[PDB]
Design a protein around this nucleic acid. Structure first.
Ligand code: CA
Ligand code: NA
Ligand code: NA
Length: 276
DNA sequence: TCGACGGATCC
DNA sequence: GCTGATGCGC
DNA sequence: GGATCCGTCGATCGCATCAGC
């Protein structure tokens, strides 16, 4: 079945207006995504912060359009240390963060340009492109190691400031989170190990899945569709991109959106509204 | 993801 | 700059 | 022994690299 995201709710559970709008988008080739008019869509969405994953683009090759682009003038980029055209994330913000850092503090896990940490006044924002378990589950052993390091890192951070984690977490948590649960239990993104790691993440930090917390029984809501077999036109997809929040931020939570119609990637963008 | 192969196993 | 091949990805 | 089923097991799309010149 096809899916229609409900309208944006812009007041908090106590009627505070939303003050912060964060958008996150796995662009799967930043240059290609810009050629497919992604920035026009971003300009219209007008986020206060924009998080991009899988940029596949070194700092040298960042297209010129990205400077001419407030109110997202404070921009930060991370690329792998020795693997061109692979992975890569970015964070663009309207206001300058207090402090920015790259990676999680673990050399094993900080070589593929996957994590940017941006600290603001009232909270910390982490954006992440989690490593794929790979075809044939080749990288599943590595994925589990990543999962534990990432959880430990995020638990530490959240013990000091309220935390927002966004990005492509490369797992569909439960069977409502993808179209074909049956046929995918041994494929990357829906192995029992990856789903379990996501569950441990929610409990050990702790964090809440913003979208599921608000729409806990809404099926067919996905953020990814493989280019093959016209999957997107059939809405045969996966929910892989999330906003996870510290529990303390749940009374700030106004809405968590899925922008199903924005094209330019094999992921659509997601949008978080917070009253801060 | 999809169809195509298999190799079962029931009616 | 161009062809052709390989890496990666749910 | 012809028909539905059920664990594999290959060909798709898209991006960006590399090897070579
Ligand atoms: Ca590969
Ligand atoms: Na019968
Ligand atoms: Na016979």
């Amino acid at each position: 079945a096809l899916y229609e995201d409900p309208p944006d709710q812009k007041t908090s559970p106590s009627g505070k207006p939303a003050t912060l709008k964060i958008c996150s988008w796995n662009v799967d080739g930043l240059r290609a995504w810009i050629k497919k008019k992604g920035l026009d869509w971003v300009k219209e969405e007008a986020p206060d912060i924009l998080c991009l994953q899988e940029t596949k683009c070194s700092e040298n090759k960042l297209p010129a359009e990205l400077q001419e682009l407030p109110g997202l003038s404070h921009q930060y980029w991370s690329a792998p240390s020795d693997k061109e055209g692979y992975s890569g994330v970015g964070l663009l913000s309207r206001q300058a963060p207090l402090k920015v850092s790259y990676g999680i503090g673990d050399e094993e896990h900080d070589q593929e340009g996957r994590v940017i940490v941006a600290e603001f006044d009232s909270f910390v924002l982490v954006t992440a492109y989690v490593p794929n378990a790979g075809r044939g589950l080749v990288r599943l052993e590595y994925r589990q190691r990543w999962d534990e390091a990432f959880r430990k890192f995020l638990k530490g951070l959240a013990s000091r400031k309220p935390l927002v984690l966004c990005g492509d977490l490369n797992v569909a948590h439960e069977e409502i989170d993808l179209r074909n649960p049956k046929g995918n239990k041994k494929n990357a993104g829906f192995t029992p190990q990856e789903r379990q790691g996501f569950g441990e993440l929610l409990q050990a930090v702790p964090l809440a899945d913003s979208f599921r917390h608000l729409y806990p029984n809404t099926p067919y809501a996905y953020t990814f569709w493989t280019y093959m077999m016209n999957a997107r036109s059939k809405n045969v997809g996966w929910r892989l991109d999330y906003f996870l929040l510290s529990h303390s931020l749940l009374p700030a939570l106004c809405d968590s959106k899925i922008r199903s119609k924005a094209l330019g990637s094999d992921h659509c963008p997601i949008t978080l509204y917070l009253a801060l």
